[PDB]
Design a binder for this molecule. Structure first.
Ligand SMILES: N[C@@H](CCC(=O)N[C@@H](CS)C(=O)NCC(=O)O)C(=O)O
Ligand SMILES: N[C@@H](CCC(=O)N[C@@H](CS)C(=O)NCC(=O)O)C(=O)O
Ligand SMILES: [Fe+3]
Ligand SMILES: [Fe+3]
Lengths: 208, 208
């Protein structure tokens, strides 16, 4: 009953796709080519003129984080109570802020700005190590004792940064074990190894 | 029980303040001076090195939208069901995207960008006009028939844009009536006319 409408890249759909796969949900991928997009028809029909577009039986959604929150809400991946729910949001918004900077780098100032970005990276990742350190010694999830939509988003964020700056997680033991632990989850491991994930570029401009 | 820690500006705390006031909630304002901020201590203690910081009892939060969602969740301003909840998020994420562009203009390119921004503005506001037209003819709220935290955020977005580009809403009848209608709510109207709000600049660099 799920349909993901996006360009042929991981980008802003990698996290939600991981969530879907890890949660054993089935969905349809509706790939939008550059030629199709430039055609202008689809874009004009999009609420904010952008993708991803998500369909949940009659319900149509836009905004990657809205989709993540929707799935987290309907699949029970939003903490045990209101207090944890606020913590989940705090983590996701944090993930979103760094994702915004990452995207800015990739598409507008990769060459001349990568040096600065990477040098500032440790300070951008430390907060997540700290969060893990204050939650059951970082042995479970980013918030509480159950996986939340924020875990998939954080996981993706971490995975794409290791490609940008290999070894960026070496100085952070909790995050490292975290990635390995979540990446090992059966369904998720299978997905991360599949061509569906592996043969799609991270971004759409060939840079990473 | 509620404490807002922020710089002496409206900025990213404007919407959450309107929400709290309109909902008849009481809170404390802890002002952080630029001098204090530059001192470094407080910043170092902030999860992501920024403000606002929000306290709800012993629950400490960061991220303006996390605070809005937390209050929306605890005060019943998040839709009547799960589907409306998703729509509320979609609206708020859209507001956040435009707020981000607005902040970018105000702080990094007011002089050279304002002209373009204003021309591109209509296309950025239309999505919200469209949303209103598909919900009771735009006579109630942005989502459903009860106010949500997204309403407060959108309202602020529209108020600051009216100052940045006087009359920008003349091209959007529903958004215009919307602003007048929400700004009329008793508790909110009193708040917007109070020194607490009026004597605070919209932004921290004097531009608007
Ligand atoms: N705030 C949105 C960002 C959407 C966005 O930036 N979409 C890009 C691709 S990642 C897009 O549609 N680009 C084509 C265009 O803007 O015409 C979200 O998180 O979903
Ligand atoms: N994503 C954050 C953005 C927070 C932010 O940009 N805070 C600014 C003021 S509005 C700040 O603390 N600036 C000082 C600094 O970055 O050192 C949110 O929505 O709260
Ligand atoms: Fe993308
Ligand atoms: Fe601010």
């Amino acid at each position: 009953p799920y349909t993901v409408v996006y360009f042929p890249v991981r980008g802003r759909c990698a996290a939600l796709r991981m969530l879907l796969a890890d949660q054993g949900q089935s969905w349809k991928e509706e790939v939008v080519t550059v030629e199709t997009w430039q055609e202008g028809s689809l874009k004009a029909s999009c609420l904010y003129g952008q993708l991803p577009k998500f369909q949940d039986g009659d319900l149509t959604l836009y905004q990657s984080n809205t989709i993540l929150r929707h799935l987290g809400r309907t699949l029970g991946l939003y903490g045990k109570d209101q207090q944890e729910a606020a913590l989940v949001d705090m983590v996701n918004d944090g993930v979103e802020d760094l994702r915004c900077k990452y995207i800015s780098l990739i598409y507008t100032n990769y060459e001349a700005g990568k040096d600065d970005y990477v040098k500032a990276l440790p300070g951008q990742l430390k907060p997540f190590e700290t969060l893990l350190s204050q939650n059951q010694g970082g042995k479970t999830f980013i918030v509480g004792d159950q996986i939340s939509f924020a875990d998939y988003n954080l996981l993706d964020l971490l995975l794409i940064h290791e490609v940008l700056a290999p070894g960026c997680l070496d100085a952070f033991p909790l995050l490292s074990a975290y990635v390995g632990r979540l990446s090992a989850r059966p369904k998720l491991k299978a997905f991360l190894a599949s061509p569906e994930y592996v043969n799609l570029p991270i971004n759409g401009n060939g840079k990473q």
